[PDB]
Amino acid sequence: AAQTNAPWGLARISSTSPGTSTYYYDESAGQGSCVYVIDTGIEASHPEFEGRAQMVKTYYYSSRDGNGHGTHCAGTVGSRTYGVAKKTQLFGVKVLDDNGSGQYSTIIAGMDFVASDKNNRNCPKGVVASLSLGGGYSSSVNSAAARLQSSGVMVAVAAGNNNADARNYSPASEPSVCTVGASDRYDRRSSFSNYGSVLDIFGPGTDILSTWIGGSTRSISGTSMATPHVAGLAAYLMTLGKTTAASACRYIADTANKGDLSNIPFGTVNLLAYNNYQA
Ligand SMILES: [Ca+2]
Numbered sequence: 442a443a444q445t446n447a448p449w450g451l452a453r454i455s456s457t458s459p460g461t462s463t464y465y466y467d468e469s470a471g472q473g474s475c476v477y478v479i480d481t482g483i484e485a486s487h488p489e490f491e492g493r494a495q496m497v498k499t500y501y502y503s504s505r506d507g508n509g510h511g512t513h514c515a516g517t518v519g520s521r522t523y524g525v526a527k528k529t530q531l532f533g534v535k536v537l538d539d540n541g542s543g544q545y546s547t548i549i550a551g552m553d554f555v556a557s558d559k560n561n562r563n564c565p566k567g568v569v570a571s572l573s574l575g576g577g578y579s580s581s582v583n584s585a586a587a588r589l590q591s592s593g594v595m596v597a598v599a600a601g602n603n604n605a606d607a608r609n610y611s612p613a614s615e616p617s618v619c620t621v622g623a624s625d626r627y628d629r630r631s632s633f634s635n636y637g638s639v640l641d642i643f644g645p646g647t648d649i650l651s652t653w654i655g656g657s658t659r660s661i662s663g664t665s666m667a668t669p670h671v672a673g674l675a676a677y678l679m680t681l682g683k684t685t686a687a688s689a690c691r692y693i694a695d696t697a698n699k700g701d702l703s704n705i706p707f708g709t710v711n712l713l714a715y716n717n718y719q720a
């Protein structure tokens with residue numbers, strides 16, 4: 442299948458070279474898999490989700506996304522027009538408030554929730570969790586991410602936006618999950634993107650068009666936008682049966698575009714997420 446005039450990031454993950462505008466993908470499109478988006482919530486009623494999204498847990502007075510951030514990330518995972526896995530099932534878990542902030546205890550609670558809740562859902566192709574959030578180092582937050590990964594969920598987390606070594610941030614610094622850096626449309630490291638040996642893979646993160654609250658769309662930037670590209674790609678490959686939850690991150694690194702990125706510091710991987718599609 443092919444989506445013409447796609448957002449540059451979708452085109453980028455289905456090509457060996459930058460500058461294309463068509464997104465090439467297998468029609469199965471992540472059907473049978475599930476992605477938990479752990480964020481500010483999801484505007485499930487957005488037409489772009491086609492009824493495939495729902496809120497399953499909130500830690501505040503309401504389950505509604507009053508911010509937009511979670512709705513944006515979810516759209517890159519699996520909205521019709523802006524998403525990687527266009528037929529996946531999306532589940533929203535609201536651990537961030539409408540200012541985009543959250544306590545570490547609440548974030549940990551949300552991760553333990555997903556590990557248990559997945560046993561009540563029908564997801565025959567597998568389960569992914571996408572975490573576009575983070576802060577200063579904390580061994581409790583890392584340990585929750587590793588629990589989630591170990592229970593059989595593919596965990597993808599943002600490297601962080603400090604142009605620094607991600608070793609000082611959590612859950613980015615947990616080695617057992619998939620830590621995602623950001624690139625721009627010219628195959629440069631995004632100027633804000635963290636780096637370091639703990640990074641596993643890069644995704645498109647500068648100028649990413651996606652769904653927004655109020656039934657709208659908007660373009661924003663961050664390792665927050667690179668993370669759902671990878672979470673979506675994992676769900677897509679799991680549905681195709683190429684890989685499992687436990688080994689998806691490594692399979693994505695193995696099959697990536699290598700050496701394509703510029704301004705990568707010595708000691709950081711030069712790997713860009715790639716779907717290897719061939720018609
Ligand atoms: Ca190339």
Ligand SMILES: [Ca+2]
Pocket residue numbers: 615616617618619620639640641
């Ligand atoms: Ca890792």
